[PDB]
């Protein structure tokens, strides 16, 4: 039921109720900050708006109408290709730093 519990978990987590996509909720460390900096205009601007919309709902302790919740099946990782490369680049540098 792992995929079954997954959709359950996704809704229990509830960032979808604020209209956020999973990648909008990642903890920002230096790798993530670099990946966000690398995003193309449209992905960056969309991210900014979703976060702004979510912070606004949070301040009012409110959530979006259910029809506007991010859908589990439509949530995709827009950040992954960028973050994965940033991490690869740092690892490469770390390897080189050993003699």
């Amino acid at each position: 039921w792992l995929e079954g519990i997954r959709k359950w978990y996704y809704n229990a987590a509830g960032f979808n109720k604020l209209g956020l996509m999973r990648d909008d909720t990642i903890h920002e460390n230096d790798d993530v900050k670099e990946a966000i900096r690398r995003l193309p205009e449209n992905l960056y601007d969309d991210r900014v708006f979703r976060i702004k919309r979510a912070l606004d709902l949070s301040m009012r302790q409110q959530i979006l109408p259910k029809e506007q919740w991010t859908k589990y099946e439509e949530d995709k990782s827009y950040l992954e290709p960028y973050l994965k490369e940033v991490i690869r680049e740092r690892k490469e540098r770390e390897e080189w730093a050993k003699k």
Partner: protein
């Protein structure tokens, strides 16, 4: 002592048009250069400056090596990676000890056949265009030569080796990808190597340099003629006057090369009076403030520019320019000693041989010959051709200049710098 090797240059043209030439000189270090028909002449008015940024981007991330790796890996072995551009070609050259050529070759292949031009890396690099250009432009000669080509041609050869200011920050990743795909193709390339085996070099080309497509096209350069004046106040005025001459390779080109040495093409003695510089002596007769003058010769695949370049105090520009011109006029009227032509030939012949005695000078020559004529012409033959030039040919090259429509460029306080129609 007794030197081992001297071996001979090996040459090969692959079915796809790529030329591979090399010379195993048994040197401790090796030199590999990938010459490409991708100089600024191939830019059009919609992508000016693209080849300049491209020249500055050899270190960006590629499919097989990250930007970080290219730098650290080449430095780890004490090697070098450089990019040289002319209005016609781009030469990516690498240097290293012979045991490390596999490392350098791989980076070179990645840079020229697999660049990624990442959006963020390309953006971060734009500022370097301003620094690179400002450094180059500290030399008034750069200002003048660039303006001279802009004034002489309607297109192609008219393009500057440096990115136009308005384009800095605007060259896109897409323009870079298209420039590479359009011009970095087998039929437009020549892989040259020193201190390397030909079979190896050849095999590398066959496996990694079979790039199909692109354009071997290219609009002829249309000589136009005209003048560009850059007023800027320097106490010294730099000026160049030329006319269309001949395409490199042609026989007439050799006469212009001889005419250039008859006229005076650069110092031979530290602090000397340039006793045998026809142009210098004529100017010295009439002007008594410091100055310098020299014949100017630029030969390209489909055109050429020949004339003279002068540097003088602002008030004496006209005097220096007219004096230099009148001196070329006397040559055009037949006044030329066979001895002077012989002296000129001596200078030209020795100058040529000295220009290819270093690995760097040799590579450039082979590489340039490989792209301009898809063949290799040894020194012996070059000297023969130079000897074959007749005094009549020299006098005629001079006539062509005198009667040809001119192109001019000057920079400095031009209050006393004559326009073409006052010469």
């Amino acid at each position: 002592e007794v030197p081992p090797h001297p071996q001979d240059l090996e040459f090969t043209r692959l079915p796809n048009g790529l030329v591979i030439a090399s010379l195993e000189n048994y040197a401790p270090a090796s030199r590999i250069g990938l010459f490409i028909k991708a100089g600024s002449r191939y830019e059009n008015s919609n992508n000016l400056g693209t080849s300049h940024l491209l020249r500055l981007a050899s270190s960006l991330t590629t499919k097989g090596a990250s930007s970080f790796k290219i730098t650290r890996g080449i430095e780890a072995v004490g090697g070098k990676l450089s990019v040289t551009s002319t209005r016609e070609n781009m030469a990516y050259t690498v240097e290293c000890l012979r045991d490390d050529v596999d490392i350098l070759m791989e980076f070179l292949l990645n840079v020229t056949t697999a660049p990624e031009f990442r959006r963020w890396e390309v953006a971060a690099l734009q500022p370097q265009l301003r620094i690179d250009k400002a450094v180059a432009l500290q030399n008034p000669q750069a200002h003048v030569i660039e303006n001279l080509h802009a004034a002489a041609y309607r297109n192609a050869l008219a393009n500057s080796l440096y990115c136009p200011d308005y384009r800095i920050g605007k060259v896109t990743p897409v323009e870079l990808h298209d420039y590479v795909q359009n011009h970095f193709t087998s039929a437009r390339m020549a892989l040259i190597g020193l201190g390397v085996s030909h079979p190896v070099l050849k095999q590398v080309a066959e496996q990694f340099l079979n790039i199909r497509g692109g354009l071997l096209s290219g609009a002829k350069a249309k000589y136009h003629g005209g003048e560009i004046r850059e007023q800027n106040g320097d106490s010294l005025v730099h000026a160049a006057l030329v006319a269309e001459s001949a395409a490199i390779g042609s026989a007439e080109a050799n006469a212009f090369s001889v005419l250039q040495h008859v006229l005076g093409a650069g110092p031979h003695v530290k602090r000397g009076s340039n006793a045998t510089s026809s142009l210098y002596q004529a100017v010295a007769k009439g002007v008594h403030q410091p100055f310098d003058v020299s014949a100017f010769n630029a030969s390209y695949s489909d055109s050429g520019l020949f004339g003279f370049y002068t540097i003088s105090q602002a008030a004496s520009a006209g005097d220096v320019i007219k004096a230099a011109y009148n001196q070329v006029k006397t040559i055009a009227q037949g006044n030329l000693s066979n001895p002077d032509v012989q002296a000129a030939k001596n200078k030209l012949k020795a100058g040529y041989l000295m220009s290819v005695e270093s690995s760097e000078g040799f590579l450039d020559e082979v590489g340039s010959q490989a792209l301009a004529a898809g063949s290799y012409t040894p020194p012996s033959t070059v000297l023969q051709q130079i000897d074959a030039v007749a005094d009549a040919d020299v006098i005629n090259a001079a006539k062509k200049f005198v009667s040809g429509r001119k192109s001019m460029a000057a920079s400095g306080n031009l209050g006393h710098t004559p326009f073409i129609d006052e010469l």
